Scaffold this active site. Structure first.
Site, PDB file in Angstrom:
ATOM      1  N   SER A   1       0.806  -1.217   0.000  1.00 39.53           N
ATOM      2  CA  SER A   1       0.000   0.000   0.000  1.00 39.53           C
ATOM      3  C   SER A   1       0.842   1.272   0.000  1.00 39.53           C
ATOM      4  O   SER A   1       0.320   2.347  -0.320  1.00 39.53           O
ATOM      5  CB  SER A   1      -1.002   0.035   1.106  1.00 39.53           C
ATOM      6  OG  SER A   1      -0.337   0.179   2.347  1.00 39.53           O
TER       7      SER A   1
ATOM      8  N   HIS B   1       1.905   4.941   4.167  1.00 38.47           N
ATOM      9  CA  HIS B   1       0.855   5.531   3.354  1.00 38.47           C
ATOM     10  C   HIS B   1       1.260   6.934   2.917  1.00 38.47           C
ATOM     11  O   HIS B   1       1.126   7.315   1.746  1.00 38.47           O
ATOM     12  CB  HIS B   1      -0.491   5.561   4.090  1.00 38.47           C
ATOM     13  CG  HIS B   1      -1.096   4.214   4.315  1.00 38.47           C
ATOM     14  ND1 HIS B   1      -2.122   4.003   5.229  1.00 38.47           N
ATOM     15  CD2 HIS B   1      -0.808   3.002   3.793  1.00 38.47           C
ATOM     16  CE1 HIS B   1      -2.458   2.731   5.235  1.00 38.47           C
ATOM     17  NE2 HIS B   1      -1.659   2.096   4.371  1.00 38.47           N
TER      18      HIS B   1
END
Lengths: 4, 171
Positions: B109, B154
């Site tokens: 991610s 992230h």
């Protein structure tokens, strides 16, 4: 444990 | 979807399956970010953290976005472009995630958030490129963040993806  | 999109999807699947047979910790011991400076010359670790997922919805959700956005970058800008986005974001989101909360983290991610940022900025400043992200998705992306999990990944990924897009969106 961490999710990326 | 091109070769780069596919290779990464198979790598993540292969690794996931190993984690199920061997268990998470066993694979983590070998693929995680260096936990000990002695290990700092085990170079794969700065990348391989991105390949590990911890639940089915973790792998699915990541590979989803990756298939969507990865494929679009690879189709529109080529395989070399997606490689570079992947390698830089994996390494940098890893670096920052480790700083936030240490080396026990994994998942694509970081790369996904970099891709999200790249496709969106590049589509805003350079509509010539033929890529764009709907604002409906950039809002969903922002909700994921505030719901946060590798928080350093992230946000570091996102940064990376905006930067590269900007650089590429002048030339």
């Amino acid at each position: 444990v961490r999710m990326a | 979807a091109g070769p780069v999109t596919w290779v990464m999807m198979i790598a993540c699947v292969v690794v996931f399956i190993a984690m199920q047979i061997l268990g998470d910790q066993e694979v983590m011991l070998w693929l995680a970010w260096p936990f000990d400076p002695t290990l700092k010359f085990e170079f794969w670790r700065y990348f391989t953290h991105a390949l590990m997922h911890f639940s089915l919805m973790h792998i699915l959700f990541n590979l989803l976005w990756w298939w969507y956005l990865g494929g679009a970058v690879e189709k529109r800008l080529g395989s070399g472009k997606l490689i570079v986005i992947t390698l830089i974001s994996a390494l940098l989101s890893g670096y920052v995630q480790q700083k936030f909360s240490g080396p026990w983290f994994g998942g694509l991610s970081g790369v996904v958030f970099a891709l999200m940022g790249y496709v969106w900025l590049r589509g805003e400043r350079d509509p010539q490129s033929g890529i764009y992200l709907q604002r409906g998705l950039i809002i969903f992306a922002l909700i994921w963040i505030v719901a946060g999990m590798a928080n350093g990944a992230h946000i570091a990924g996102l940064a990376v993806g905006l930067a590269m897009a900007f650089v590429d969106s002048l030339n």
